[PDB]
Amino acid sequence: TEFKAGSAKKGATLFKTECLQCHTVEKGGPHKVGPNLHGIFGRHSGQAEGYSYTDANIKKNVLWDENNMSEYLTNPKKYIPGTKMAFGGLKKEKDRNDLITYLKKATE
Ligand SMILES: O=S(=O)(O)c1cc2c(O)c(c1)Cc1cc(S(=O)(=O)O)cc(c1O)Cc1cc(S(=O)(=O)O)cc(c1O)Cc1cc(S(=O)(=O)O)cc(c1O)C2
Numbered sequence: 875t876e877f878k879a880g881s882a883k884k885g886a887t888l889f890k891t892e893c894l895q896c897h898t899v900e901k902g903g904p905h906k907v908g909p910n911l912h913g914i915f916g917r918h919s920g921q922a923e924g925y926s927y928t929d930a931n932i933k934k935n936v937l938w939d940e941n942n943m944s945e946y947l948t949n950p951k952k953y954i955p956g957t958k959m960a961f962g963g964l965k966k967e968k969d970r971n972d973l974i975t976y977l978k979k980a981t982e
């Protein structure tokens with residue numbers, strides 16, 4: 875995948891509709907169905923403190939960046955078979971770029 879910097883404004887809306895159900899982004903924010911996402915970029919997968927992950931999410935051991943995040947969010951179970959993230963994916967390229975542009979800011 876080839877991430878291109880988009881609109882964090884549009885991305886914030888996408889996060890609210892597609893992700894917020896299962897995730898928070900703020901430092902010190904709570905785990906929900908899914909892990910809090912603060913500090914995700916530049917950290918290996920399956921490491922949010924206090925959250926119990928699948929073996930698949932831990933053993934993937936991917937250093938998250940904008941490009942591999944874009945592949946993951948296209949089709950989560952295809953990138954990490956055995957995941958328990960029940961999200962089908964964002965099939966539209968502009969949606970992935972906008973979402974990731976937001977996530978880079980919101981998880982810092
Ligand atoms: O910065 S903005 O988010 O406000 C913006 C709005 C519009 C834009 O046309 C663009 C930016 C430029 C643009 C960027 C990209 S990116 O490189 O992926 O970031 C892609 C496109 C684009 O026009 C092409 C494009 C793709 C899609 S997709 O099917 O979802 O992948 C939809 C659209 C595209 O133009 C339609 C579209 C949606 C939107 S939306 O408000 O985000 O829904 C704004 C604008 C649009 O032209 C009108």
Ligand code: HEC
Pocket residue numbers: 889892893894895896897907908909914918919920921922926927928930931947956957958959960961964973977
């Ligand atoms: C619940 C129904 C979810 C929705 C909707 C989304 N996510 Fe999720 N995510 C969820 C779980 C249960 C998990 C852990 C999965 C496991 O196998 O253990 C995740 C994981 C992620 C990750 C990886 C985190 C890590 O520390 O490696 C990311 C980056 C992630 N989720 C992001 C994300 C985004 C951006 C979403 C909206 C598009 C989204 N998720 C939806 C549960 C759920």
